[PDB]
Design a protein around this nucleic acid. Structure first.
Lengths: 98, 90, 110
DNA sequence: GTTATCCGCTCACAATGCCACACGCCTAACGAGCCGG
């Protein structure tokens, strides 16, 4: 089973899982420990942000690949804003300084 | 092609300056449109960047010296354009 | 004898401006509305009597009958369709099953 | 006495990762609808 660019879920903007629903693999927690254990820094940033959960980042990346320029645009993951919006649903002020 | 890396880590400092310096060299070679020093062998830009690192013609000091020189030439050339505009007005 | 307008006394406040500026200059060119874009519609109103409009007002009863006919026919057809499409199966249950499944595709994002 | 401790009872909180597959995700009675008897 393979995937280049497929569908996305509703709540968080992650790709789905499974073969039938045309999904991507779960690059799980222990693999993040493994990439931290090397000196790998940018590759962890792509596997966390450009490949999923940054909407404008990933469409900018796709257009940028088709144009033939390998850059990246970091952005900020939509799932973190989800986390903020359901901590604010409790009585907990939480913001970002500066 | 290229298999090894250890000819560069003994030339540049560590395994982490090599990443940033060779990525910067390959980024200005791919898109900025500069011609490579050693000849290509129908390889990508990462491998020819690592080749120019390990032979010893691209380095972080050398990158900043070349960028300062060509940028100073760029602002000097556009000052020459401004003086040409001043010649054309009066 | 009132002259209790704010714009009038404000123009009288700036009377030196219109005294200095209008030296060999015109005063105002202000166009009004023209009767070209006004239909007079005054060909005949003598048979247009008030008591004849009293005996004969306007009428859209046929419009209401037509609209009621459309509503009644559409209600009958939609009641029959919602009668024989959402019926209840009896004593045995749903004799089939839906089984519908949707797979995935490879959708680019340019 | 009264005070500073020791001990037994009760209760919140944790228990790998990934994959496929597959089938499941209300209703007896309170506000409307039709028109028969």
């Amino acid at each position: 089973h393979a995937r280049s660019t497929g569908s996305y879920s509703l709540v968080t903007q992650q790709p789905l899982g499974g073969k039938a629903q045309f999904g991507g693999q779960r690059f799980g927690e222990m693999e993040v420990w493994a990439l931290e254990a090397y000196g790998a820094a940018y590759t962890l940033q792509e596997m966390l942000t450009v490949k999923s959960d940054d909407v404008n980042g990933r469409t900018k990346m796709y257009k940028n690949i088709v144009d033939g320029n390998h850059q990246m645009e970091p952005g900020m993951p939509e799932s973190f804003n989800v986390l903020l919006k359901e901590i604010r649903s409790l009585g907990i002020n939480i913001e970002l300084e500066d | 092609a290229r298999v090894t890396v250890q000819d560069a880590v003994e030339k540049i400092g560590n395994r982490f300056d090599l990443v940033l310096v060779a990525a910067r060299r390959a980024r200005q070679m791919q898109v900025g449109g500069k011609d490579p020093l050693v000849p290509e062998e129908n390889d990508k830009t990462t491998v020819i960047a690592l080749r120019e690192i390990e032979e010893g013609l691209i380095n972080n000091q050398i990158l900043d010296v070349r960028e300062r020189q060509e940028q100073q030439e760029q602002e000097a050339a556009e000052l020459q354009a401004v003086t040409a505009i001043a010649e054309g007005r009066r | 004898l009132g002259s209790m307008d704010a714009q009038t006394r404000r123009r009288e406040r700036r009377a030196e401006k219109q005294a200095q500026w209008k030296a060999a200059n015109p005063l105002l060119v202000g166009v009004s509305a023209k009767p070209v874009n006004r239909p007079i519609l005054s060909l005949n109103r003598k048979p247009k009597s008030r008591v004849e409009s009293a005996l004969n007002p306007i009428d859209l009863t046929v419009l209401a009958e037509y609209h009621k006919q459309i509503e009644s026919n559409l209600q009958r057809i939609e009641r029959k369709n919602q009668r024989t499409w959402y019926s209840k199966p009896g004593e045995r249950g749903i004799t089939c099953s839906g089984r519908q499944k949707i797979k995935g595709k490879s959708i680019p994002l340019i």
